[PDB]
Amino acid sequence: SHKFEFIENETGTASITISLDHYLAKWIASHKGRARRNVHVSFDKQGARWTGRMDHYDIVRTKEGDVYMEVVFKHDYEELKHIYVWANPFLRPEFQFPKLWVMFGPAKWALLLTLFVNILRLETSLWTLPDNPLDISEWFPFSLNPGNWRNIVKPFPFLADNSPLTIVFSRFKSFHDTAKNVLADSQLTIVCRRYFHGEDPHPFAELSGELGLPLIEGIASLIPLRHGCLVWDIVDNSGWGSETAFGGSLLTGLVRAVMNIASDGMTEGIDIY
């Protein structure tokens, strides 16, 4: 058997039950046989991909005589619970000024930049920040050198970010604890996909134009990413601030609407189209 669960903005889990005479169960059990000891799974179905890392395994012998292995995995979201938002990412632990990380901007930009500066710290990077660090045009040629990195943010154009203006703050919170309320109040989903060579397209490729030409030619040569690189993004799956529907009828259809926060900050108006 196998089981896997996806949760919005939380760590899903997965498990496999397997025979001990399976050659892959023997590979999981033999930690001598792996120089690079961690074990990862992917489950692929209908373009969706669950990926995660093994937490533990049980080899069980029951009273009734059944012998089996259970392997348990945690979803890749768990990386954000093992990344801390330092008060200043660009300074040593010995000196942390200003005392709070604080950022104001569109919610997708403010969260993804707060992640990108801690990914720069963890990848030991010496890169000078542009005026907008999440503009892809600043990352190449031979600028960011992302080729060896385990984690990266998907870049995007700032003038198109419609996500609501907000404050992200931390003094050595986890990124999960930092983003929890911002994602809930903005109604946003963080998403991650691992790039697999030879089956996925490059994560940053897009075909925008009149003729539909690639927006940056040779993007895989300019922005190389290793096999298994975890690309972070934030997606706006609740159009509450622009256009969506909260209800409706099977007879006449869904009722289109917009929400706006009134000037007291507490009450939301609903405007029906």
Partner: protein, 100 residues
């Protein structure tokens, strides 16, 4: 929509502020905010107004009733208050004034 929160003091905004998302921050810059300057008899009256500029108006306005010839509304701001306090300075110590 019509509600947006107030930008907090010193928060980063698009373009990175003064200190470039904090990457241009150093211990030397940060210490210059809370350390008292290195001073000596040749520098001290240039050092004094840099200390007075740290202070809130509630502190500086307790000099207002003592200083003569103040300009109209000068103590309404910190720079204007420090300008008025430095206008009250005389270039000899209080004991020499009282002996003479």
């Amino acid at each position: 929509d019509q509600w947006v929160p107030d930008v907090p003091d010193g928060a980063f905004v698009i373009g990175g502020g003064d200190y470039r998302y904090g990457q241009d921050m150093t211990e030397d810059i940060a210490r210059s905010l809370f350390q008292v300057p290195d001073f000596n008899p040749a520098n001290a009256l240039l050092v004094l107004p840099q200390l007075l500029l740290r202070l809130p108006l509630e502190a500086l306005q307790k000099f207002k009733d003592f200083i003569p010839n103040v300009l109209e509304g000068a103590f309404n701001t910190v720079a204007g208050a420090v300008d008025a306090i430095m206008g009250a300075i005389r270039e000899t110590p209080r004991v020499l004034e009282q002996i003479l």
